[PDB]
């Protein structure tokens, strides 16, 4: 209560993202396995992460084939955890436009959202 929400990324580029906050009012569990949108092509599922190579600590990004949710739960697709890459953008993305997307959920289903268009 709450209005959780997130932002797809304004980019003139060749690629963008898509960040939100996604939680389950259900009494089973959800496990998000992809989403889908008019204003790009390829779309992928990433994490973000830190990790150690050198002895030393690293971050980067990297695809994955799923996130899932608990009952009553949540996650965010925050830019320092999680998001979606859009790839062959079907416009350039403008803060101040919104964004219909299907959030693909494993088996047979998927729940259509908005976000705003925002620069970050």
């Known amino acids: ?3 959780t929400e997130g932002w797809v990324r304004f980019s003139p580029g060749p690629n963008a993202a898509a960040y939100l906050t996604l939680e389950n009012p259900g009494d089973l569990p959800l496990r998000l396995v992809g989403a889908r949108t008019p204003v790009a092509e390829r ?3 990433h994490e973000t992460f830190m990790r150690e190579v050198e002895g030393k600590k690293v971050m980067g990004m ?3 084939p799923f996130l899932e949710v608990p009952p009553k739960g949540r996650v965010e697709l925050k830019p320092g955890g999680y998001h979606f890459m859009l790839l062959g953008l079907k416009r350039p993305l403008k803060a101040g436009e919104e964004v219909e997307l ?3 959920f494993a088996g047979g289903k998927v729940l ?3 976000l705003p268009v925002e620069a970050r």
């Open 112 to 114: 259509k959202v908005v």
């Open 43 to 45: 779309v992928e599922l």
């Open 102 to 104: 299907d959030l693909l």
């Open 62 to 64: 990297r695809p994955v």
């Open 1 to 3: 209560g709450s209005f």
